[PDB]
Amino acid sequence: SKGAAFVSKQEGSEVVKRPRRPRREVCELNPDCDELADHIGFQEAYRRFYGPV
């Protein structure tokens, strides 16, 4: 429970969770938009590299 990387046992244990709001992810297709901004420390590194935004 220290930082974003570490999670509690209760959160990890739950198998029956809600994936969306439909999976069936096939290969090929497309990178399908950019979730990349949700990476850990992405905002801080971006602000350092390119200044305030």
């Binding site: 220290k2 930082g3 974003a4 990387a5 570490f6 999670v7 509690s8 046992k9 209760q10 959160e11 990890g12 244990s13 739950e14 198998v15 029956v16 969770k17 999976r23 069936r24 992810e25 096939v26 290969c27 090929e28 297709l29 497309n30 990178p31 399908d32 950019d34 990349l36 901004a37 990476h39 850990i40 420390g41 992405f42 590194a45 971006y46 350092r48 590299f49 390119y50 200044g51 305030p52 935004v53």
Partner: protein, 698 residues
């Protein structure tokens, strides 16, 4: 004269000796079709670089200072800094433009080829069939004399203006397209394709609407979607070669590629295949098309006169002169054609050598031509770590320090992720760890089952490319026919209940924690022998076939498999909190409808007044129920407005979005090139330019 010679274009006697084979493979041929294909390929790659290769998104994928776990084919390869990456993509763009215009053709092909494969080998998660095909086509066109017609290099050099080319340039391309079609067709001769499982839900698209006039949905999803693809693959492999069947083959292939472009989001692959399909026609079709125009167009279109002799072909001399002895480039071209086609035939079936990459499927995805053959659905991913100093046990966020999600299906990527986590966790107060993975996945709607052993430390695990991995669980094909019965169970539920089917090995156990919201959860056994243990009171019960148990909500429970064979069971659950919220919301909806239609003459409660007003101004904050109700109503209105949108507006928004992508890519490239050349200015100027780059076009 012989029928075989007319159909195949060469006589048997041509293959009697090596010299005759070289002469046959280097006979003169018109260059026009090759030039048209080169132009179209260059144009499509130019359009493809700023969209799918990721130039627009490259500022948030290779950011300096960020800590990311990469997945390169070779561990030695590492990304350069961001600016050199943008320089590399700029070189790619220049090479693609040069190929399109045919200016300095060999240099342009090299500049397009080397960076493209550098980017391709850097990341295994972005691999896919249509990128491998682009790489191969770029490799082939590097050697072909495709600049002999309709090229700027022709204008700058008289010797290379409307000149002959050897036949093997067309032979290699025709062989490549034929191998693609045929290998794709044979790979789809699998039990999961001929039976209707893969791509089961694509028949509902409106493009298949006319077929429903004569066929039911279940037959429409089998005869048309599945068998049609196989038959078209084999036929389009064979029909286009022969003159008799070329028209029907072209029609069917064009329809097939247009439908694939509309249904999927594959990108430029459909258009590339459409551009390659005319290649099987006669080599001189652009010339006769140019001839069939008025004189005014002919003053602008390429030349129509017959091509001149060249030096890169073996010319039969009918003057009584001895035949031109083939030199070196002709023999090299013949050997290149034969060896390259043999290698292309061999490589898709080379999975018995690189057994390290083998999995439930075969080898890494990208170079097997097995398109839309396997569909996977992941349920849960648990990453556990044990500290090497204190002994504490903890759990990690499943998608930490990663950008893709294909590591859940390949042992090698899992090993690389484990090594990356091992190197990175010491920054977070964790000593030399031991990491365990537990991943659940089902292919083509089978029982969800483990893919890696959850008792093996992946950091210290053994892996080599050319040996079978000893900690990859086998796929149970014996439980395949159950997919029938399970589907029936899927149709016997209410609109609220949900079901998840699990299959487990002997010896292993699954620990689970049912959340408090999921009240009224049950477990039923379908096959095998299992024991369900509740740890609140430490009580374990052995369940036989056809028995049901009501699990607690908000507590931990465990299931152990205690049979010689794998055990299959099923969780059936309903979300109580959502049901109660829906009932309350329906009650509130009923109340507002009574208020509006004139009923319920009595004064409304104060909590209902914000609903009629619709705005929280000058009053107490709304309760959570009111906020949820207003949010649902606003969302429904927004969706309804989105549905009621004319076509022209959608087209305009699409064009504006694409223009935004192109503009952002160009501006970021210019900023970084300036940074490389003239140095990096102050932070404020960089911030201003970056802000200007991201502005929407409007």
């Amino acid at each position: 004269d012989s029928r075989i010679g007319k159909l195949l274009g060469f006589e048997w006697t041509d293959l009697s000796s090596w010299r005759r084979l070289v002469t046959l493979l280097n006979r003169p041929t018109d260059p026009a079709s090759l030039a048209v294909f080169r132009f179209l390929f260059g144009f499509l790659m130019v359009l493809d670089i700023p969209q799918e290769r990721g130039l627009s998104s490259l500022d948030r994928k290779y950011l300096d200072g960020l800590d990311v776990c990469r997945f390169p084919l070779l561990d030695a390869l590492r990304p350069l800094p961001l600016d050199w990456m943008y320089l590399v993509y700029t070189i790619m763009f220049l090479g693609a433009l040069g190929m399109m215009l045919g200016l300095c053709y060999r240099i342009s092909c090299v500049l397009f080829l080397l960076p493209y494969w550098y980017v391709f080998l850097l990341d295994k998660t972005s691999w896919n069939n249509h990128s491998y095909l682009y790489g191969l086509l770029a490799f082939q066109l590097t050697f072909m004399d495709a600049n002999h017609y309709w090229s700027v290099d022709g204008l700058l050099n008289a010797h290379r203006r409307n000149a002959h080319v050897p036949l093997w340039n067309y032979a290699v391309l025709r062989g490549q397209i034929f191998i693609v079609y045929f290998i794709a067709g044979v790979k789809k001769l699998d039990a999961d394709w001929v039976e209707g499982y893969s791509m089961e839900y694509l028949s509902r698209h409106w493009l298949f609407s006319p077929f429903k006039l004569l066929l039911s949905e279940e037959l429409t999803s089998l005869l048309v979607v599945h068998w049609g693809g196989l038959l078209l693959d084999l036929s389009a492999g064979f029909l286009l070669f022969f003159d008799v069947s070329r028209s029907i083959g072209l029609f069917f292939v064009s329809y097939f590629h247009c439908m694939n472009s509309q249904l999927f989001s594959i990108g430029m692959f459909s258009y590339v295949m459409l551009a390659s399909s005319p290649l099987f026609c006669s080599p001189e079709w652009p010339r006769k098309l140019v001839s069939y125009c008025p004189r005014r167009l002919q003053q602008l279109l390429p030349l129509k006169a017959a091509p001149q002799p060249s030096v890169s072909c073996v010319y039969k001399r009918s003057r009584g002169k001895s035949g031109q002895k083939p030199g070196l480039r002709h023999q090299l071209g013949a050997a290149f054609t034969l060896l390259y086609l043999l290698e292309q035939l061999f490589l898709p079936y080379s999975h018995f050598l690189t057994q390290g990459y083998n999995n439930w499927t075969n080898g890494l995805y990208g170079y097997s031509w097995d398109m839309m053959v396997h569909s996977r659905s992941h349920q849960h991913v648990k990453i556990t770590y044990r500290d090497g100093r204190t002994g504490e046990l903890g759990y990690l966020n499943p998608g930490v320090f990663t950008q893709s999600r294909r590591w859940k299906d390949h042992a090698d990527m899992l090993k690389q992720y484990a090594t990356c986590l091992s190197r990175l966790l010491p920054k977070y107060n964790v000593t030399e760890p031991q990491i365990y993975f537990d991943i659940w996945v089902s292919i083509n709607d089978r029982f969800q089952q483990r893919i890696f052993d959850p008792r093996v430390d992946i950091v210290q695990a053994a892996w080599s490319p050319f040996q079978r991995t000893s900690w990859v669980q086998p796929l149970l094909m014996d439980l395949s026919p159950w997919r029938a019965k399970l589907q029936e169970i899927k149709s016997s539920l209410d609109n609220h209940t949900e079901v998840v089917f699990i299959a487990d090995f002997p010896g292993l156990h699954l620990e689970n924690f049912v959340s408090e919201d999921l009240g009224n959860t049950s477990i039923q056994l379908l096959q095998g022998e299992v024991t369900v243990e509740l740890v609140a009171e430490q009580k374990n019960q052995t369940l036989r076939e056809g028995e049901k148990m009501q699990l607690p909500a908000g507590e931990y429970h465990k299931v152990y498999t205690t049979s010689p064979s794998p055990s299959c069971y099923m969780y059936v659950y309903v979300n109580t909190t959502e049901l109660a919220l829906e009932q309350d919301l329906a009650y509130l909806q009923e109340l507002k409808e009574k208020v509006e239609n004139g009923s319920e003459t009595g004064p409304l409660p104060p909590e209902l007044q914000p609903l009629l007003e619709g705005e929280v101004k000058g009053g107490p904050e709304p309760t959570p129920l009111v906020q949820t109700f207003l949010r649902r109503q606003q969302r429904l209105q927004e969706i309804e407005r989105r549905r009621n949108t004319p076509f022209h507006e959608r087209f305009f928004r699409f064009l504006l979005r694409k223009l935004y992508v192109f503009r952002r890519s160009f501006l970021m490239t210019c900023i970084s090139l300036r940074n490389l050349i003239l140095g990096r200015p102050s932070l404020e100027q960089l911030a201003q330019e970056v802000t200007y780059a991201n502005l929407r076009p409007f």
